[PDB]
């Protein structure tokens, strides 16, 4: 049922690229999502990442819980810590943010959220880094095609995503263990572009655009999308399919396009067995600001580093990362980094 596209290796701006980008936009506007074909290498790397994830999740909780940092939000999140619309969600998560050594100038300077990933081991590290390198190449192709499909300069989005704050959430959902099967409630993702991969089990549902339906701007206080539409059709089951990733827009793409793209609502149902998946965020630079593309007189901006830092401080208010931001007043660095820019 979902539409599938094959991306060119290089996006150059030829008229065929523009046609493809238009078709990607149309698929998002119709279905909220599409598939992209993976080649043998992309597929191999995806499967290796899922295998590493499964092995890590079998480690004892005492070890998993030690994979945390007070410099970066990368690392482990136990089941039941994340909350959607007031209700705790079920997956355990390993988050991979930009892996910066303590010698990096941003880590030395104490920028919030910047530091080395607390990897469980080097084998897991290599599997996830190799996968994320491929995901990033796809993210850049997608963003060039999306700019072209809107008749924008080809580098409109990729100028923002140079050294972007790309990150991945590596998920394990438990089997169902009672009448409850809400693995994650309905929500929209805070990022720019989401590339999702899953194993063969099944559980992701997405909501297409619906004519006449009011959608909230989830980047605004007071317009949370959490829980909305959860018990009303339409919800499309994202059938596990060999040889594809799926792609949907996040909140920052909804903001930049003024709602011509909508951030795709989605939710996860627990299956009768455990399920592994990955959600990759292809993001602006920490220092970049998103802006409305089609409303030149609009003053509103989303500063990405501020957006991310505030999101994760709210997600994980007692994590040692959040404690150190507060103890050392690391949010002051964000204020400073804006000072002499246009």
231 is in an annotated binding site: no
Mark the segment that binds Cl ion (CB under 5 A) among 75-83, 146-154, 274-282, 321-329.
Answer: 274-282
CA distances from 73 to 3, 42, 67, 77, 227 (A): 35, 27, 10, 9, 25
Q: Considering only residues 291-330, where is the footprint of Mn ion by CB under 5 A?
A: none
Q: Based on the shown chain and the rule CB under 5 A, indicate whether residue 89 belongs to the binding site for Mn ion.
A: no
Query: Closest distance between Cl ion and the C-beta of residue 198, in Å?
Result: 6
Give 52: exposed, middle or buried? Use CB within 10 Å, 0-12, 13-18, 19+: buried
**Angle at the Cα of 213 from the Cα atoms of 212 and 214, rounded to 5 degrees:** 120
Q: Which among 133, 65, 66, 52 is positioned nearest to 99, based on CA atoms?
A: 133
Judged by DSSP in three states, 21 sits in helix
Residue 204 binds which one of Cl ion, Mn ion, none, with CB within 5 to 8 A depending on kind?
Cl ion
In the complex with Mn ion, which residue's Cβ is closer, 140 or 251? 251
Helix, strand, coil tally for the chain in percent (to 5):
30, 20, 50
Q: Which does 189 bind (CB under 5 to 8 A by kind): Mn ion, Cl ion, none?
A: Mn ion
From its phi and psi, is residue 298 left (phi > 0), alpha (psi between -120 and 50) or beta? Answer: beta
Cβ atoms within 10 Å, residue 179: 5
SS3 (DSSP) at 271: coil
Write the interaction track for Cl ion spanning residues 219-258; mark x where CB under 5 A is met and - where it is not: ----------------------------------------
Radius of gyration for the chain, computed over Cα atoms and rounded to the nearest angstrom: 19
For residues 67 and 301, give the distance between their C-alpha atoms in angstroms, rounded to a whole number.
34
Instruction: Compute the distance between CA of residue 186 and CA of residue 111 in angstroms, rounded to an integer.
Output: 32
* Count of residues of this chain found to bind Mn ion when the rule CB under 5 A is applied: 1
CB of 55 to Mn ion, least distance (A): 24
Tell me if 204 contacts Cl ion by CB under 5 A.
yes
**Nearest distance in Å: CB 277, Cl ion:** 4
Q: Is 187 annotated as a binding residue?
A: yes
Instruction: Choose the contact partner of 283 out of Mn ion, Cl ion, none; CB within 5 to 8 A by kind.
Output: none
Look at residue 261 and give the partner it binds from Mn ion, Cl ion, none, a contact being a CB closer than 5 to 8 Å depending on partner kind. none
- In the stretch 133-172, what mask flags binding to Mn ion with x, by CB under 5 A? ----------------------------------------
Residue 84 C-beta: closest distance to Mn ion, Å: 9
Counting contacts by CB under 5 A, is residue 277 touching Cl ion? yes
Tell me how far, at minimum, the Cβ of 189 lies from Mn ion, in Å: 4
Beta bridge partners of 244: 37
Per CB under 5 A, 186 contacts Cl ion = no
The whole-angstrom separation of Cα 85 and Cα 267 is 12
Of residues 173 through 192, those in contact with Mn ion by CB under 5 A are 189
Phi–psi pair at 333, nearest 5 degrees:
-65, -35
Query: At closest approach, how far in Å is the CB of 23 from Cl ion?
Result: 25
Distance, CA of 48 to CA of 41 (rounded, Å): 11
Least separation, in Å, of the C-beta of 226 and Mn ion? 10
Residues making up the annotated binding site for Fe cation are 187, 266
Question: Which residues of the shown chain bind Mn ion in the complex (CB under 5 A)?
Answer: 189
Residues making up the annotated binding site are 187, 266
């Amino acid at each position: 049922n979902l539409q599938t596209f094959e991306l060119p290796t290089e996006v150059t701006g030829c008229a065929a690229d523009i046609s493809l980008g238009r078709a990607l936009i149309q698929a998002w506007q119709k279905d909220g999502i599409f598939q992209i074909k993976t080649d043998s290498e992309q597929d191999r790397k995806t499967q290796e990442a899922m295998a590493a994830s499964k092995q890590f999740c079998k480690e004892p909780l005492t070890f998993k819980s030690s994979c945390v940092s007070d410099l970066t939000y990368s690392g482990y999140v136990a089941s039941g810590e994340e909350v959607t619309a007031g209700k705790p969600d079920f997956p355990e998560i390993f988050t991979v943010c930009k892996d910066l050594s303590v010698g990096d100038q941003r880590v030395k300077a104490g920028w919030p959220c910047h530091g080395p990933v607390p990897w469980p081991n080097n084998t897991y590290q290599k599997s996830m880094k190799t996968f994320m390198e491929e995901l990033g190449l796809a993210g850049e192709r997608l963003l060039k095609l999306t700019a072209l499909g809107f008749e924008l300069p080809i580098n409109t989005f990729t100028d923002l995503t140079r050294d972007g704050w790309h990150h991945m959430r590596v998920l394990r959902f438990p089997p169902q263990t009672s009448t409850l099967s809400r693995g994650i409630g309905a929500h929209t993702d805070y990022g720019l572009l989401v590339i999702a991969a899953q194993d063969d089990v099944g559980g992701l549902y997405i909501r297409p655009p619906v004519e006449g339906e009011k959608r909230n701007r989830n980047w605004l206080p007071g317009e949370s999308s959490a829980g909305m539409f959860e018990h009303d059709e339409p919800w499309t089951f994202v059938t596990p399919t060999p040889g594809v990733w799926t792609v949907f827009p996040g909140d920052i793409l909804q903001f930049m396009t003024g709602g011509q793209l909508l951030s795709t609502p989605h939710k996860v149902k627990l299956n009768t067995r455990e399920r592994f998946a990955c959600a990759y965020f292809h993001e602006p630079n920490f220092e970049a600001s998103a802006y409305p593309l089609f409303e030149p007189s609009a003053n509103e901006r989303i500063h990405y580093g501020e957006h991310f830092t505030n999101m994760f401080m709210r997600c994980y208010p007692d994590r040692i990362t959040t404690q150190r931001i507060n103890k050392e007043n690391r949010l002051a660095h964000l204020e400073d980094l804006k000072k002499y820019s246009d």
